[PDB]
Amino acid sequence: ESNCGCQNGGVCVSYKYFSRIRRCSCPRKFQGEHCEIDASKTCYHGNGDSYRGKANTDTKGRPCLAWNAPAVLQKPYNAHRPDAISLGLGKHNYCRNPDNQKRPWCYVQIGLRQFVQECMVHDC
Amino acid sequence: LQCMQCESNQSCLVEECALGQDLCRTTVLREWQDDRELEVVTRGCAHSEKTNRTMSYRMGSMIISLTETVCATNLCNRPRPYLECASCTSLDQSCERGREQSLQCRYPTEHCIEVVTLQSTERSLKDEDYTRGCGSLPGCPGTAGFHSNQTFHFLKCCNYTHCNGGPVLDLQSFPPNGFQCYSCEGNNTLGCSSEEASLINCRGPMNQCLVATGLRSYTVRGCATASWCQGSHVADSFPTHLNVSVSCCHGSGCNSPT
Ligand SMILES: *[C@@H]1O[C@H](CO)[C@@H](O)[C@H](O)[C@H]1NC(C)=O
Ligand SMILES: *[C@@H]1O[C@H](CO)[C@@H](O)[C@H](O)[C@H]1NC(C)=O
Ligand SMILES: *[C@@H]1O[C@H](CO)[C@@H](O)[C@H](O)[C@H]1NC(C)=O
């Protein structure tokens, strides 16, 4: 079974000597710490609110910053959010669109600041 | 003792331990596979007696590497994080087949290890049945273990090449030594007694009759080693709990309700 946050075919395996810490044992399709990631997805559907894929760059080239980042943890939408699980935001670097917004985006470093830029992921 | 606490995706709090807890856990779990490292840290107050410990093994095309680190000072957990032995997990059906991809420890001081956890019905623990890998745990060079009517744990740890290949370890592989213990798991005092708990027939290396407890208030008795009965083991033998008062002695009815 799963009941640990193990999305999809996730299997919950724990670890006695290491303080019942858990990890999920993912099937091929779903990567990430909960099997939260559909790594087959190549386009996004509609607006993106659902998109859990793995676009990580932006429409100029630049790479996305990790929802982890010490940088990003000041920004409102980031991986520590109490809600972050259901919105796709996690220890990755991908694109999401948790609030509203035409397509999926991510926090991009440019010079010094952290602008929110728009991802690549082609629409269907 | 003040010490940062925080599960996986959480931010950290300044937790602050009570009389009993005097160390600061900083467990990290990592995985590599097809150049994707993903690493999950949890921190919090530790306890009286836990030990800088390390484990790693491989399931399929990946390596998971658990490590634990403790210290007895204020917020000493914070922001930032060779010898061959057989490997495999029960999970991917690899420790059970007469074949199992192997591995080589990356720290001197590491060991070779087999860890067994066998549980019945809807089992309280999400732990592989059999695991073989590299690393150091409580009371290493040597062995620990304890069996109950419905449960059987056992560790084995050695400083010699592939010291852990060959046959796995079931129940029947142990010589009913002849000595006995008790097995109890209901609730509090009257879930089990001289009435709803019976004498187990102790098996081989197990010869210590043992009890366990913690505060809602879970309790367990049976047949164990002297290494098991000592150190961190027993404690983690179940989800979480107190100072988990624990007891050992010689005798068949050693562990009968006192
Ligand atoms: C558990 O912890 C404290 C340590 O401060 C101890 O004094 C207390 O009696 C223990 N509880 C028991 C043995 O029930
Ligand atoms: C545990 O780790 C610390 C710091 O990481 C190290 O200095 C210390 O010696 C270790 N504990 C023991 C008891 O050796
Ligand atoms: C343990 O292994 C080390 C090297 O890993 C070696 O120097 C030593 O001879 C070994 N000793 C024992 C008792 O296993």
**DSSP per position, A56-122:** -BBTTS-BBPPSS-TTGGGSSSSTTSTTTTTTT-SSS---B--S--SS-EEEEEETTEEEEEEB---
Helix (H) or strand (E) segment spanning residue B236: helix B233-236
Q: How many CB atoms lie within 10 A of CB B148?
A: 24
CA nearest neighbour of B6 among A6, A7, A82, A114? A82
By the CB < 8 Å criterion, does A23 face chain B?
A: yes
User: CA-to-CA distance for B134 and B110, rounded, in angstroms?
Assistant: 6
Last residue of a domain, one of B57, B81, B105: B81
User: CA-to-CA distance for B222 and B242, rounded, in angstroms?
Assistant: 19
Q: Which domain holds residue B131?
A: 82-174
State the DSSP code for B234. H
CA nearest neighbour of B143 among B120, B182, B118, B169? B169
What phi and psi values does residue A74 have, to the nearest 5 degrees? -85, -35
What phi and psi values does residue B236 have, to the nearest 5 degrees? -75, -5
The answer for residues whose C-beta is within 8 angstroms of residue A54's C-beta and 6 or more apart is A31, A37, A39, A41, A92, A94
Does A84 sit within 8 Å of B36, measured CB to CB? no
How many Å separate Cα A116 from the centre of its chain?
Answer: 15
Cβ atoms of A41 and A53 closer than 8 Å: yes
B91 and B103 fall within a common domain: yes
CA nearest neighbour of B212 among B179, B240, B235? B235
User: CA-to-CA distance for B144 and B123, rounded, in angstroms?
Assistant: 21
User: CA-to-CA distance for B153 and B131, rounded, in angstroms?
Assistant: 12
User: CA-to-CA distance for A53 and A63, rounded, in angstroms?
Assistant: 15
Last residue of a domain, one of B18, B50, B81: B81
A22 and A62 fall within a common domain: no
**Solving technique:** X-ray
What is the b/e burial string over B79-101, where b = at least 16 CB atoms within 10 angstroms of the residue's CB? eeeebebbbbbbbbebbeeeebe
Q: CATH no. for residue A89? A: 2.40.20.10
3 state SS of B217: coil
A65 and A50 fall within a common domain: yes
A69 and A33 fall within a common domain: no
Total count of domains within chain A: 2
Total count of domains within chain B: 3
Q: Kindly state the tokens that stand for B124.
A: 């309280």
By the CB < 8 Å criterion, does A13 face chain B?
A: yes
Nearest chain B CA: its distance from A106 CA (Å): 19
- Burial class from Cβ neighbours inside 10 Å (0-12, 13-18, 19+) for residue B73 reads exposed
A55 and A29 fall within a common domain: no
Query: Assign residue A101 a region: left if phi > 0, alpha if psi is -120 to 50, beta otherwise?
Result: left
Nearest chain A CA: its distance from B194 CA (Å): 31
Cβ atoms of A64 and A57 closer than 8 Å: yes
Q: Which of B9, B57, B117 to mutate to test the interface with A (most CBs of A within 10 A)?
A: B9
Q: Which domain holds residue A3?
A: 1-42
User: CA-to-CA distance for B206 and B144, rounded, in angstroms?
Assistant: 9
Last residue of a domain, one of B148, B174, B200: B174
B57, B113, B164 from B86: Cα distances, Å: 9, 9, 6
A21 and A53 fall within a common domain: no
Decide whether any atom of ligand 1 lies within 6 Å of the B48 Cβ: no
- Residue in B71, B77, B107 to alter for ligand 2 test, most ligand atoms within 8 A of Cβ: B71
- Burial class from Cβ neighbours inside 10 Å (0-12, 13-18, 19+) for residue B134 reads buried
How many Å separate Cα B223 from the centre of its chain?
Answer: 16
By the CB < 8 Å criterion, does A32 face chain B?
A: yes
Size of interface A-B (CB pairs under 8 A): 74
Decide whether any atom of ligand 2 lies within 6 Å of the B52 Cβ: yes
Estimate the share of chain B in helix, then strand, then coil, as percent rounded to the nearest 5.
5, 40, 60
State the DSSP code for B253. G
CA torsion sign for B221, B223, B227, B228 is: negative
Measured between beta carbons, the chain A residues lying within 8 angstroms of B29 are: 15, 18, 21, 23
B111 and B161 fall within a common domain: yes
State the DSSP code for A5. S
Q: Where are the beta strands (DSSP E) in chain B?
A: 2-5, 13-16, 24-32, 38-45, 53-59, 62-68, 84-86, 88-89, 102-104, 112-119, 130-136, 142-147, 151-158, 180-183, 198-201, 208-212, 220-224, 246-249
A25 and A37 fall within a common domain: yes
Q: CATH no. for residue B112? A: 2.10.60.10
